[PDB]
Design a protein around this ligand. Structure first.
Ligand code: NAG
Ligand code: NAG
Lengths: 49, 36, 255, 34, 49
């Protein structure tokens, strides 16, 4: 999964991956490029048998 | 089917019996590796 | 009030005739496809349709249509459907679980020891892709599995095959129902300036809503808005003093 | 020789036009720093 | 903007591709899903008020 930032008169200007870093997953979950200080819940973890 | 430095990028994908070909272009600097 | 419909340039009638009236039909173990494009095709010359109603097929426009040559036993025609349980159907021709087109049944009385089908293969088959036994309909007498001709049609994208219907002129700054390449809607059309890529077609803003349309004929830019609507209210002094009320129309410049 | 790919391998996933918005997809793409 | 299990998420695309007995079930699914969403929004608004 990706998340693409368009613009006015806009082609693809910036994009950050959704499965690279926990910060990247946080950016992908809050759906914004700027996250203020705090605690956030993103997904659930599980062990594959 | 018959039809009519720099870095050129082709992206190939295959699904549902179909194959998509994508093209791109960018002028780059002459260097041994690829710049970011 | 009024109506605007814009379609691309009409072309010649494309020849469905020789692909339905063909003197020879390929087998199933060798699967040939017949690509059909750049058309104004009339379907009134023409079963079961899965996804598109056959009566309303004449109106909407498509990107590209694909027709397939396919010869199969008589009672096996009911196994050509999305997600069928047939292992033989799993081995010769698989239809995808999501389907859009139609299946047509045809007779072949004139047609032996020439057609085969593969029934031994390791693993399943992904759809629309490419040890043998002879078929059984060699005896021309009517038994019950007399062969049939089956052609299947398979149909967001650039469009070149549209229904034959008259194109009209375009009205501006007055809300109207519009039909752009089969995309229907209703609203005000405005000549606003929003940039498009030269290959780009449509425009949506937030909620999968058709907002901007490139004109299919003169290649200009049309913004779509919904024309005026809202809640209405009535104010009254109570029906004990009078019977005259007043009407409030909400959030409209009511010229 | 063994290199890395960063900020590369992005394309338009579909054929509609947006402005000042954000969209998420699930198709095949090139992961960053691969 | 979700289809709720129907063949498409746009009502005008449903009414331009089906007759008046195969589009009825898809229309029913859209009615049920959007009714659930609107009722949920009304309940949250009542509690916040
Ligand atoms: C389509 O038809 C219009 C109306 O005759 C014409 O002006 C135009 O050149 C045609 N071709 C294209 C590509 O729009
Ligand atoms: C309503 O529209 C007219 C003409 O476009 C304009 O003169 C008038 O100022 C508008 N009303 C408001 C409240 O903006």
């Amino acid at each position: 999964t990706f998340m693409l930032k368009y613009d006015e008169n806009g082609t693809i200007t910036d994009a950050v991956d959704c499965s690279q870093n926990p910060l990247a997953e946080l950016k992908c979950s809050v759906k914004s490029f700027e996250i203020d200080k705090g605690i956030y819940q993103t997904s659930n973890f599980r062990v594959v048998p | 089917y018959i039809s009519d430095k720099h870095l050129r990028e082709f992206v190939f994908k295959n699904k549902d019996g179909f194959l998509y070909v994508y093209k791109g272009y960018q002028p780059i600097d002459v260097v041994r590796d690829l710049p970011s | 009030s009024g109506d605007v419909v814009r379609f691309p340039n009409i072309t010649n009638l494309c020849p469905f005739g020789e692909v339905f009236n063909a003197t020879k039909f390929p087998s199933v173990y060798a699967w040939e496809r017949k690509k059909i494009s750049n058309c104004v095709a009339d379907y009134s010359v023409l079963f079961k349709c899965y996804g598109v109603s056959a009566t309303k097929l004449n109106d909407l426009c498509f990107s590209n249509v694909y027709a397939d040559s396919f010869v199969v036993k008589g009672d096996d025609v009911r196994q050509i459907a999305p997600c069928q349980t047939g292992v033989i159907a799993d081995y010769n021709y698989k239809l995808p679980d999501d389907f859009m087109g139609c299946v047509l049944a045809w007779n072949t009385r004139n047609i032996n020891y020439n057609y085969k089908y593969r029934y031994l293969r390791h693993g399943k088959l992904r759809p629309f892709e490419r040890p043998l036994n002879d078929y059984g309909f060699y005896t021309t007498t009517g038994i019950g599995y007399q062969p049939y001709r089956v052609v299947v049609l398979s149909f967001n994208a650039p469009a070149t095959v549209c229904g034959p219907k008259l194109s009209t002129d375009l009205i501006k700054n007055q809300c109207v129902n519009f039909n752009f390449n089969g995309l229907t809607g209703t609203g005000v059309l405005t000549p606003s300036s929003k940039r498009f890529q030269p290959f780009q077609q449509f425009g949506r803003d937030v909620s999968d809503f058709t907002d901007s349309v490139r004109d299919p004929k003169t290649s200009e830019i049309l913004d779509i808005s919904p024309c005026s609507f809202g809640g209405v209210s009535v104010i009254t002094p109570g029906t004990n003093a009078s019977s005259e009320v007043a009407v409030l129309y909400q959030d409209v410049n009511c010229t | 020789t063994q290199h890395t790919s960063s900020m590369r391998g992005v394309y338009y996933p579909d054929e509609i036009f947006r402005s000042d918005t954000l969209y998420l997809t699930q198709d095949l793409f090139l992961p960053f720093y691969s | 903007s979700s289809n709720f299990g129907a063949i498409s998420s746009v009502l005008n695309d449903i009414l331009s591709r089906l007759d008046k007995c195969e589009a009825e079930v898809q229309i029913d699914r859209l009615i049920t899903g959007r009714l659930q969403s609107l009722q949920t929004y009304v309940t949250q608004q009542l509690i916040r008020a």
